[PDB]
Structures are given as structure tokens and as C-alpha cells.
Design a protein around this ligand. Sequence first.
Ligand code: MG
Ligand code: MG
Ligand code: MG
Ligand code: MG
Ligand code: MG
Ligand code: MG
Lengths: 443, 443, 444
Amino acid sequence: KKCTTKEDVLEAVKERDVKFIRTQFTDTLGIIKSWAIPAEQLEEAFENGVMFDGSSIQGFTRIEESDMKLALDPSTFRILPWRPATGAVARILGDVYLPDGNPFKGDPRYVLKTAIKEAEKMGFSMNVGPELEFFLFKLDANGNPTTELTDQGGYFDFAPLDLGQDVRRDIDYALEHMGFQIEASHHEVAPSQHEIDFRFGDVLCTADNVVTFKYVVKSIAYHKGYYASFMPKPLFGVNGSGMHSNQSLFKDGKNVFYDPDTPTKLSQDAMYYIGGLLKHIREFTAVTNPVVNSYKRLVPGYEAPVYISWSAQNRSSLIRIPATRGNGTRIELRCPDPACNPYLAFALMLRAGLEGIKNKIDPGEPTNVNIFHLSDKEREERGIRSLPADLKEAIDEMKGSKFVKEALGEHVFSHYLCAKEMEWDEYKAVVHPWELSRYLSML
Amino acid sequence: KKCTTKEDVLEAVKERDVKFIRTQFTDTLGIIKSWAIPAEQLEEAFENGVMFDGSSIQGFTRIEESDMKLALDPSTFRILPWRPATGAVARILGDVYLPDGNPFKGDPRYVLKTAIKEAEKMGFSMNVGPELEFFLFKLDANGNPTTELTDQGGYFDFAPLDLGQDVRRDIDYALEHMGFQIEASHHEVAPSQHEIDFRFGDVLCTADNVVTFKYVVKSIAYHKGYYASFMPKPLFGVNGSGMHSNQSLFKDGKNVFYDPDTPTKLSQDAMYYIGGLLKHIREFTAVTNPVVNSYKRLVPGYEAPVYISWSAQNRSSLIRIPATRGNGTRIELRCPDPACNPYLAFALMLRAGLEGIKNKIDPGEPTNVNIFHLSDKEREERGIRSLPADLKEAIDEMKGSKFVKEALGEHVFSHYLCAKEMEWDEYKAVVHPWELSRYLSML
Amino acid sequence: MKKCTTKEDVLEAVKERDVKFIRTQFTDTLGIIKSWAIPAEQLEEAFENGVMFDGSSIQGFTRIEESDMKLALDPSTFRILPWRPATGAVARILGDVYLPDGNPFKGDPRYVLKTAIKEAEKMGFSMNVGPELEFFLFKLDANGNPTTELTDQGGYFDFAPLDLGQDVRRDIDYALEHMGFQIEASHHEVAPSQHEIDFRFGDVLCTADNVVTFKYVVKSIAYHKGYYASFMPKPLFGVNGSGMHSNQSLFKDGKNVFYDPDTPTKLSQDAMYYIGGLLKHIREFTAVTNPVVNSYKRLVPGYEAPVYISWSAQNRSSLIRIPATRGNGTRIELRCPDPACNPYLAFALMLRAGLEGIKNKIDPGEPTNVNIFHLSDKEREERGIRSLPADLKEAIDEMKGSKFVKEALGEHVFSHYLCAKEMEWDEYKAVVHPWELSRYLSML
Ligand SMILES: [Mg+2]
Ligand SMILES: [Mg+2]
Ligand SMILES: [Mg+2]
Ligand SMILES: [Mg+2]
Ligand SMILES: [Mg+2]
Ligand SMILES: [Mg+2]
């Protein structure tokens, strides 16, 4: 089941009776985009490319069309894990080009590719294993999503044990049937919350899978009567959903972060990589935490980190070093939530870590104390800064950042910020029922 | 009906058959406070004072009691506008003292008195006429307040014309029966919204009346089946409720703001007074706009001002000069909402205006253009700043302000900020239904 | 079924039986069953290098920070679950938890039971356990949530229920036998909709693993037939609660060391000392055998649950009972625990207490052949008959100052267990219950 050439794809389409091909790409804000191609037209698509409206990539801030061409990558062909009676369905990715023949710089996948390209200039290749947390909710009588609980279980609980036990198994099976190579799946801290850990793979292939994961899990749950939610904080008072990103660099086949003779067995480049991450994380929190609801997860008192720090012992730090060493040496960034665009988030993580190695950015001493247990003046002395407290603050930090603008390009940078600003200007004017409950009788 | 001495009060209590006396004071956050005294004990109260728990003034941030004494002011005695079958009811104010005999610096009324005291050092006395906007809503089946409309009328509409016509008349009559001397009352822009304009009077007496107004209107409406709401923005998409504060200074009986020979007929001190207001308004917006809901009114596109500016022509400026001249020359600050503590708000307005005259603070050229019609870069050149966009930003501006700390005192200053911070930390973590409507199906 | 010994045994069985997912199985400090799924393709590498996982999951709801830990899979614990999804077969597997430095994690309750077994081996003893698990079978509401709605109104040993509940009850028994549980007996219990399943009398470590497996297997099977299986100690007022009677005996040289043909009761001196140690320390770890606030709504007089510390051979209502069987079947039954307890911690502490009795020759005193429930405080005080802790707070306080429980559990488990139970009690003691409104709202 390893596809390399267009002839590999075409023969598998004929042998497996694939009738529809679905393109897969994402817009600037991480929404999954697609259109359907009948398989009869697939051979022409491989030869000539497929023309489509490129403003779909631009987000919801689009006004004008832009004719663009999608050059299909046969190595991304993959059959979807459901079987219509008519025939099989498969997804395929590709690269977006302008009519003049130049690659469209506004595709988030292209943005990730340039970061991979800059990493290869120094001989580095990046591997990532994301830990994706989500909620399994009930549908109402009309089939609409709700936040109604499907179980009351806790961390690593063997739950649910009713019919929800079968949908969770169906989700894991569907991913395995598609070649995901899941490492582990388990119940998360909050009721009805679940986590699936990806295999440690190369960043580009992993990023494509994070996108595929989201609509596969969504579709499988829907067809069983449940709703899979990737909201950061759908429920007050319980754990939010993060997307922890374990990352590692390789050069000449060996792990760049590992060093057998150092006290912590962590290399100098590992320290530099953390320094770049710590130096720039505030500038692209708006990308790792892209929606207004993201910052309801980034509040003190839960697993989510709100203070910029690193440690090898405390969990609640922004960056944590797992105990694993050798070829598996990795660092874990714990702030992102599964609403982020994986292409933009992974690219900025790579660029920030690369800038740490380039500029020999010291990360400081690790914070082994639970920072939540500290006063504001204590953190002030130790130089412990915090993440932006809402989307608007994150927007302002990203607005004036030379690092983020150069890494995304002036087109992705502008369009992402403009959409997020429109988002906040809508939210900031809403009068919420909490305000009514608090002030109607008081004032 | 003019009371001057304790014997004036005691005889009127006997003649008018007053059976209960209600003390009236406010806490640090502007909530109206009270306790009941049977009229038989009133004569002892005038002689010795009344001991009460002073931590009631401290707000909801109180932990320890503090025994304090209220020295009743017989000139504030006033009979309430409803008539129980048992007997009449009256309100009375006073000054709060510590057991050692010193005035308690934490009473907001005392804070206003010191600003009046500092104004008298330069020969100034301040007169204020507040324009109080409120909403008239329906009660549900259980008598609880709602936001259900009582009319659909607009600006200056003769509405409502149903039974709501009688409660609005009852409210105006009750205030007139109590000696308020209302200037005008009319329908406001939003449906079910109403405004009552006070007589131009001295700041201390006016501030006491703003407090009395709130619970009188509340009680009169309740007993007719309606709810009077003083929320800034109870309803999205329609006008909020402000408390415009027209103010003027007098020295030697003549209006300090008037000058017959100047082009605009406005004196130099009037310009200085505006300059101090403009220089400091950002530092005490947290007092004029004290609740989270206040900044749902301070959004662009309605009558509320969000840009720091002054003009004699445009309404939508933060400070506006009415056309009236001579003894009636006044300036109007349009940002406050009726949730503010009138003692703290008027005191800071007086101090800021006084600091303008002391330091000869130029207010700049007036902005006669509708600032809302301008780009961000246009306002940048003209030095046009904006008000804080939420309660947290207003808290931070007040936290580091030497002017506000000195004018309120270190005890009111600390307690006010601590309560408002607890307020924001509760609001910032709430997951609102708007987030569910926007992100549950998307993410 | 089959018995697996090597990793090659398990890997073969995965292929020939089309097992697609392996579920790890362990417990947190409080006894909550913990698991995560491994794809069968990953299983071969799991046997070679172990599986990294967040070991703070073992701490319970008192976990402060993450802790990387390794699970070394035990091939002999591989067992196929008794449901057959269309996708493929499912199996569970246990293992040992190791720290990154290579040492075993002392906070795993399974490790705690294993060191108790090691103390028995030092004195030449191996311990066998047969538990009797009581549970309730309730209806689900219209939304699929558990209720306390009855499924039958039968009593002790009744042939009930006889409606569709007869089938789910039989499905539970069939699936346990399908996994090789070798059930001794299953019957209706005293309370309506209450049931009992009697485990095979076998090795303590294997039996403790089966108790954890039993709970989620019964719950999942009941769930899929529209019923809820409850292991609450006392879900309903006014009827019997659910207990976990723990039969036990020691063996040495393949002989039962509790049996003596020569003595009058046909019990050896070691059995007397073993009882003495149990009676000496039972108060100090009642918080382990009866771990939740609801446990002490069962530990009240009048419903078969023992509240007084005594032993006897005749009447069951004693804390410790001697069944009539002798010879190789000689055992002593401890009747205080409920199915909410962690079996690893409860069995470990029973063993340690009994072994402490043997090594210190602790006399158990005269048996109390009368029903203690018929005695005054004066009569009970005259015979020096003590009570079990009356609520979780009292049991916590008795466990907090026990040097014995701290040594047997280890510091990590000891503090983490107590801290969690204290937070549980502090939350409970502040609640204003509807019973208080019914009694006081009108009166005061
Ligand atoms: Mg997690
Ligand atoms: Mg993690
Ligand atoms: Mg108006
Ligand atoms: Mg006005
Ligand atoms: Mg029984
Ligand atoms: Mg029994």
C-alpha cells in the first residue's frame, strides 16, 4: 500500500474500484478544504493539473477570485476508511501554482515546505509526533452537535463501556486501516475527552495526517450518532483540548538533540532549539491558539500552560523534555490546541527552533517549581513571562513581529491577521448571558 | 420641606408619622447600602451616632469586620415617595467615623468631600447635572427581571402608550414628590430605553440624589410589574445606557467657564479643565465604566464615545461643549454609565479638571470631524487615543496611576482594584454560548 | 482459551485469532481501572522495548505533574476479551511499571501486592484468595445513563430475574467462563436486583488481576444489553449493601498451613496467629477495604455487614468467619470489604497483617459465638469488642497514624491515598443534602 508514481495511483484506482477522488488542502486559518473529482478524470488531472478557485485558500476574507492550478502528488494518495455501496473513496494532496507557473506562496502547505527547505540548508530534518485531544459528544434529536456527555470517565479510564465503546474502537480502527500507525489512544482528563498519539514521522507527512485525522474522526463519529469536537475549551470547569507537539531534529541520520556525555544527556543544539522557541512563542501564539475559545483553555489551574518556561521535571511548563533519550530524544511544546493550522504551527516551531540554533539563543535555567504556586513578584524576578491572555493580545504580538512575517510571507501574514481581527471585533461586542446573570438584577 | 437641624427632622418624623428611617450609603464599587432604624431610636441616633459594620463599605472583598460609627446629617433627611399602611418611610445620610473619632477615609462620600475641599482651596465650587439613561423591561411569570421589551419606540418618542405609560409617569411623579427637580424626561434611542435629566446642583447633593434615584426608580417600577435596569449594555445591537455628566465651576458666584470676549465665549480655565480631563480619563475609565458589561457599550457605532477628544460641534466626542453660555456654561463628559459610583466618578472628574487648571494643561485643538469615519493612521497623526477596550485594560491603566491613587486614597484605590480584578478573572474564564455557536460545528 | 508464556506465544495468538487491538490494564492508587489501546501491529515492538506512558495516571485525581514511565508487558497475562467486534478481536494485557532510571515504580498497587507476596515467600508462604463479589443490576434511563431502577424484586438465591434480565445475567456468566474465570457459583443476593459471583479459589496475584478484569467486563456486557452493573457499596437505603467477602489461606510445601487435624477446631496455630494479626490491624486499613464515603452507609448495624471486630466459627455476622470446610480447603473469610476497594492494596494489607500476626504470635482471643448486635455498649465494653470506623473520616484518621500501613504500602502510595481520600471527605462534609431540607426546612 505504498504509492510512488501516477501509474501506481491509476492502477490502484482501477483495482480497488475507486469512483471519487477528493482533493485535500487547508485555508489560511486551518479549515479543511476539498472538492470531488470523478476517478475517470484522474488521469487527465495527473497530466495537466486541476484548475480551481484559489481564493478558497484565502479564508473568509476573500473578495476576488484567483484561478490557480493544483498539481497532484501521487505519493499522498490514500483510500478513505469508509466504503460506499457505489464504490471506494480516496483523498489526494498536491501543490498549488499560479497561472504563470510559480508556486502560490499563500498555501499553508507551501509555508511548511519552505521551513523544511531552510532546515535542509543546515542539514536538519524535523520529525513530529502530535498528541491530539478531542471530545466525544452526543447529537441532539435533529442530529446537531451538542456538548452532552457520553461518559463520566477520567484520565486513562477504560471508558466509555456502552455503545460509545464501539465508536471509539471504530475511530482507532479507521485510522489504522488508513496507515496512520497510531502509537497509543486513551481517555483524557475531562469527561468524554479522548486522546490519540501519532507515530513520530517527518513533519510534512505528519502535518497532512493531522488534517486527514480531523475529518476522518468527524465522519466516523457522525455515522454512529456521536460528535467529535476539536474545540479547545467546549466546557467550563474541566480540562481543555491541546495538541502537544513532540519534535526532534536529525542530521546525518542521528538525533541532533541527543548527547551521551552531557549531564541531562541533552545536546547544546537542543538547548538552543528551546531558546528560539521560548524567544518567539509569544509572537505566534495566535497561530498555535487561533480562536477566541483557545484562551479559555489558556487559563491557570488546568493542564494547559500559561507561563513561558521549560523543564525536564514539571509537566505544567510550556516546553517539557520527556525522559526518553537516544534516537527518541524529543522536546514537547504543550500550548497548541487542535484548532491550529498544523502547517503554519509546525513551520513556525521549526523556524523558531532553527533561529535558536543559528543565533545560539540560551534558554535560561529550567523552572522546576510549579509556577502556578508563585506570586506575581516571584515570577517577575525569575524573568517568567506569560502567554497572551486573549486572542486580541496574541494578534497584537504577531502584528509587530518581523520573525512571523518573514516565516509566513507577507500574504499569509496579512490575511491571517485580518481574519483574526474581524473575529475579535465580532466577539468583543457580544453581550453574553453571563453578563445578564451577573448585572441585570445588580445594576 | 427644608430640613436643617436635628429638631427639624424629629418634628417632621412625629408630624408625618414616619416609623422607619433608612440609612443610605454606598460601598467602594457603588452598590447602594442601607439598614433600617425604627424612628423611636432616631433621637438617640442624632445624639450619639449609630454603630454599624464598616466592612459593608469595603465591597465583596471584605474578610474582617470593622466597627464604625455613622454620624447622621439632618439636612439629608428626605421622605421616600411610597406610603406603607403602617407609616411613612424616610432616608438619611451621614458621615462614617472610626472608633478613634477620625473620619473613615474609605467612604466614597468622604472621597468626594475631599475633592470638594481641594476645590475650595482655590475658590472653586462644582455643579453637576447628570443625564441618567435606563431601560424599562418586563418581569417574567416569577417576578424576575428579564430583557423583554415594554415598547418599540425611539428617540424622544411619546412611548409607551399602554400601562407602561403609567409607570413612567409614576417614576417622574415620585421623583418630583421627593424634591428632585427633574429638568426633562424622555424616551431614549433604544427600545424601552428612557432618560431623566437632573437639575444642575452642587456635586455633593447631586451625587446623593443619583444614588437615591436608582433605588426609588427600581422600587416604583417593581411595584407596577416592571423592571428598571441600569446595565450599560443589556441588549446587543442597540444603544447602551450612559450617565452624561455636565459640570461647571463657580468662583465668587460667577461661572468660571464663561468668558464674553473670547471667540467661543469659553474661558481659559474651561480649556484647562478639559485638558486635565483629557489627560487623565484613561486612568479612571475603570471608575466611570466599572463593570465588564460597560465595555460592550464602549464599542464603535453608537452614541457612546470610544475616542479621547473634545469638540463644540460633534456629539460623538468624549467631551462636548453645549451651546449654552453665561451662567449656564458647562462641559459634558459622555463616557460614564449609570453603573459607576457617582461619588468616585464626580470626585475624579473634579480632580482631573482641577489638575488641568493648576498645571495649565492645554487640551489641543477640537476634533470637529466624526472620528469614527477615520482610519487608524489618520487618528495616529492627530494624536487621537482611544478609551480602554475592556475592563482588564482599564484596570491596568488605573493600577499604575499616581493621580488616581492620590485622589481616592490608598485604601479605596487598593480595594476597588482588587474587586475589579477578581471580577475580570471570573469573566475571562467563562465559555460563552456565542463560542459554542461559532466553534462547535466548525472545529 | 489457552495459556501464554512467551511473547512468541502471544504474537502467534494475535495472528491466528485476528486480534487487532491490545488493551493494557492497570489501576490507579484508588482502584479506578486504567487502560490504553495499542494496535496489534505495535505489539511486537512493545514486547522488545516496553511502552512509555504518563505514569501520573496511577496517582489518581491527585496527580500534580506528568511522570514518564515504562510498562513492560507480561505475556502470561494476555487474555482475549469476551466480545467479538466485526473489526477484530480484542485482548487485554498487564505488566510492570518502571521508572526511566530502570527501577520498578513503587507507586503501582500491583507492585505493592507483589512485595507482600515476597514477604510471604520469605517465611515460606503463598497466599490463595477467593473473593465473593456482590453487585447490582439496574436499568438505564432513556438517555443511557445509570439509575437505581430495579430490574427484579427477588431475594436471596431467587431464580430472578425471569424477563430479558435473565439473558443479560446469563450473558455475564457465559463471558466470564469464556475468559477462563472458572466461576464457582453465581446467584441472586438478598437485596432486589442484587447478584453475586463467587471466584475460583486461587493465587492472590492472579485473582486480584481477575477482580479488576471482572468489573469492566461485567459493566460493558450489561451496558450493551441495556442494563447497568453497579459496584457501589450501598446504592439503596433500607436494603442490603454490596460487599466483597475475601476468603484466604496460606500454603507451604503445597500443604494448607491453616489446617491441623489434631486441634479441636481443626485449625492450626498459624491460622490463630493469622486471625490475630488481622484483628490487630483491621481498623488501621478499613479506609482501604472500605474506601469511599458510601462504604459506611453499608457499615451500619442490621444488614449483614460487620461493624464489630470479632471472629467466630459459627455465625457469619462476625468480621472474620471460618467456613466449615477443612483439609486443603481450610480458609478464613474477612467480610468487611466492599467491591469499591483496590484489590491489590486490600489483599496486600490482609496478607501483611496476617503475616504480622504469625511472626509476632498474636493471640486472637476467644471467639464471640453470640450475635454482637444483640448486646449493649456495656456488654460489648465488658468483652472489649471494638467497632470498625464509623465513617471515612474516622478510617482516614486511623490510617494516618498507622506505622504498619505506611510500611506495607510505601510512602508514595500512603500519602497519595490519604491525600485523595481527605479531599473526598472535605467535599462531602460541606454538602447540604436533601435529607436536611426535609427534616429542618419546615421546623426551623
Ligand atoms: Mg494529555
Ligand atoms: Mg503530552
Ligand atoms: Mg441621551
Ligand atoms: Mg448628553
Ligand atoms: Mg453474600
Ligand atoms: Mg460469604
